[PDB]
Ligand binder design. Structure first.
Ligand SMILES: [Mg+2]
Ligand SMILES: [Mg+2]
Ligand SMILES: [Zn+2]
Ligand SMILES: [Zn+2]
Ligand SMILES: [Zn+2]
Ligand SMILES: [Zn+2]
Lengths: 449, 449
């Protein structure tokens, strides 16, 4: 069919010190872009969330990994781009809370309604709203939700659970934090419980431990959430090997991948940024993480199988893939960790585009939930916060900075950030939009009511 | 002719607390976007540089001025969008310097070659390269260069001067800082002298004092740079009233507007951010600047007249307009002063679009040289640097942070930033591009050799 181009090379054209050497473009876009514009309907949609992966996160990753004139074959390759707003809401006044958390933002792009920090699937009135995933499942479409964080953490949970607070993981915490939701108290239940009820075809990530809890009320009272899964049809896999033995993954044989007690281990090791570290200490070179066992699947691997299983549905599918720890390491002021994670995601995003071009009716979207702390500063910056110099692909030093908190956790920031898309309806992310528009853009491309 | 739509409303559709209330989109873009793609040649081009106005600077200003669900009629209204890279070069190794200054960046978009921080119109070998303005003048097109900074400052000087350091304002400093350029030493000369030789039709800004210097060598030796200007044909205006009396402005009657000794006064007052200021001090509300005399033209006012004068050329024109102090107040950790300047810029950008739509073959581009320091943080952020909470249009507090420097000057940052465009060839800004492409995009739109 009329193939929509996917940016093949936005890397520098040559000698960056020479005239025309640093150009990313080779010729005029007008035609190429025009060939990317389609209001055909998406058969499927894959949405890649780089948790806290704003433009600075992207630059620092490219800069370190592929060099300043380099180019991410996935993240940088989506043709249509824009910047979106992601403000949350103050619960009491319903006023904008300029800086959102994982909870409110996820709810935003999945239900189309703004909310307060810490909420999952509810508007500020605590009223429920159906998720893009739920709507899909009803339409007969296959659903998938992948992530490197515990499956209970906001971003993935936002598509299946409806709770007043995000801390309402499983049984124990919900009873004493989300009573109105508590199963025993007559509510729908904990995030975990609600996820198992949700029943999406493919659900992979960490968070094994919240499955150790036993239900209190309900049909499965007494038994651990784990057994309830199995008992209800769920195939349980815990490693690369078992993950590959799957062939079918459908409403009767849903796949539940629990690859870590909590979050999946980080891709790279590197010390954490320190006070004056860019000046008092040697420049860092990132290293692979010894701890991460070779049996723990990688985001791209997870993304790959999901796609392979999900693609079987004649109607189509929906898949959320999250590279969660970009944000986490960003909170930890740990460059190597964070950068490596963005790389991890780029890899997954590559795997998504590859399929996007072959199939031809897919919508690929890459973006973040919000902006974060890290900033690329000058080698000699003498800062008040946490810094650290890194040796980049170019053989140059690059200095990173964390200084928007004295609390030991570096904070999110409120800046608008990038949203790139490729395929049918990819046009709706261009210019300035709001994260809730993302929701509407998925519903309409997918032709959902 | 086929009119290209200019984003009329990306404000929220309604109640931000309700489902679909926070949306900026009202329908599908595909067609509207289609109707914006043209490879027709631009008759003219207007380039709006918000010095240091990256996405965080845009959000903070829209948040405070128009509210989070608000929309900038100028800045936010340009249909086509993308993110570009602006790294500079190390002079010694020709390696990437991840964080450029005003000088190198300006040089990148105007000549099309990367350079080291502090250079104006030279590559790292100190070899000269023609500017887009210079090329335009030769092509027979009208030229204009507008700024709120002293005309000598990098951003506006980059289009007419070729100096080893940006500190080579006029006579004195050049002799002792850019010997190879110094007139008497045989060189082309100081930035001022080079500007006066450049002879662009319209040149308005600040920097009156560098014109008090007297040339040393040359035809006009002994006399002050100012008399030389008059002696050569320049119409010298110094206020709104004189600026409006101009009718012609061309090669024989070139206009030179010097509206301030140095930089033009800022638009808004507001105190400077302080340590723990968001917690220790009351929330601030910006105020207009009392100092700013009513006779000092405003950026939009200046942009307006430039356009009016420049529009007279049957061939076309080229116009660089810079809102300079966004960056200057940003260095100063002064939210009210910084936001005010971004607003000041939006006003001028509106002017540009207004014309852009009427004429029909204009290319408008709005962007910044680099990213800067400010960050929108949480009301209760307990930070190491400079903070300050402000009362926004929403009636909510918005906290801003400055903490990438213990030096009393807040630093630039290397993050990739937005670049929106409207008109012929506006497509070439979509996706990831590099600041030097911007140079090639102007050259081909304007059909220059
Ligand atoms: Mg997450
Ligand atoms: Mg400037
Ligand atoms: Zn997040
Ligand atoms: Zn976070
Ligand atoms: Zn600057
Ligand atoms: Zn600056």
């Amino acid at each position: 069919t009329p193939e929509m181009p996917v940016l093949e090379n936005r890397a520098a054209q040559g000698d960056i010190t020479a005239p025309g050497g640093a150009r990313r473009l080779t010729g005029d876009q007008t035609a190429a872009l025009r060939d990317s514009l389609s209001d055909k309907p998406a058969k499927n949609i894959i949405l890649l969330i780089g948790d806290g992966m704003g433009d600075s996160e992207i630059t620092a990753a490219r800069n370190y990994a592929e060099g300043a004139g380099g180019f991410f074959k996935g993240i940088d390759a989506l043709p249509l781009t824009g910047q979106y707003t992601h403000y949350a809401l103050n619960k009491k006044t319903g006023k904008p809370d300029y800086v959102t958390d994982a909870a409110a933002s996820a709810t935003a792009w999945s239900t189309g309604v703004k909310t307060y920090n810490g909420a999952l699937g509810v508007d500020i009135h605590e009223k429920d709203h159906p998720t893009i995933l739920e709507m899909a499942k009803a339409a007969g479409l296959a659903t998938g939700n992948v992530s490197t964080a515990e499956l209970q953490d906001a971003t993935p949970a936002a598509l299946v659970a409806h709770v007043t607070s995000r801390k309402c993981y499983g049984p124990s915490a919900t009873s004493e934090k989300c009573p109105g939701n508590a199963l025993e108290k007559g509510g729908k239940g904990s995030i975990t419980e609600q996820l198992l009820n949700a029943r999406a075809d493919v659900t992979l990530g960490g968070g094994a431990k919240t499955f150790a809890e036993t239900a209190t009320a309900g049909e499965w009272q007494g038994k651990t959430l784990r057994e309830q899964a199995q008992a209800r049809g769920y195939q349980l896999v815990s490693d690369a090997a078992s993950l590959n033995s799957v062939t079918e993954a459908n409403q009767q044989k849903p796949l539940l991948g629990l690859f870590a007690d909590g979050n999946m281990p980080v891709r790279w090791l590197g010390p954490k940024a320190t006070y004056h570290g860019n000046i008092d200490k040697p420049a860092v070179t990132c290293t692979p993480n010894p701890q991460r066992n070779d049996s723990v699947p990688t985001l791209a691997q997870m993304t790959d199988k999901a796609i392979e299983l999900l693609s079987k549905n004649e109607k189509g599918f929906f898949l959320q893939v999250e590279g969660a720890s970009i944000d986490k390491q960003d909170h930890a002021a740990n460059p190597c960790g964070q950068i490596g994670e963005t790389v991890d995601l780029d890899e997954a995003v590559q795997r998504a585009l590859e399929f996007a071009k072959k199939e031809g009716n897919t919508l690929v979207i890459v973006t973040a939930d919000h902006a974060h702390a890290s900033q690329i500063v000058a080698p000699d910056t003498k800062a008040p916060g946490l810094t650290q110099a890194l040796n980049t692909k170019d053989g140059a030093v690059m200095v990173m900075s964390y200084g928007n908190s004295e609390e030991d956790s570096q904070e999110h920031t409120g800046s608008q950030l990038r949203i790139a898309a490729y395929g049918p309806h990819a046009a709706n992310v261009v210019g300035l939009t709001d994260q809730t528009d993302l929701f509407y853009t998925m519903k309409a491309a997918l032709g959902l009511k």
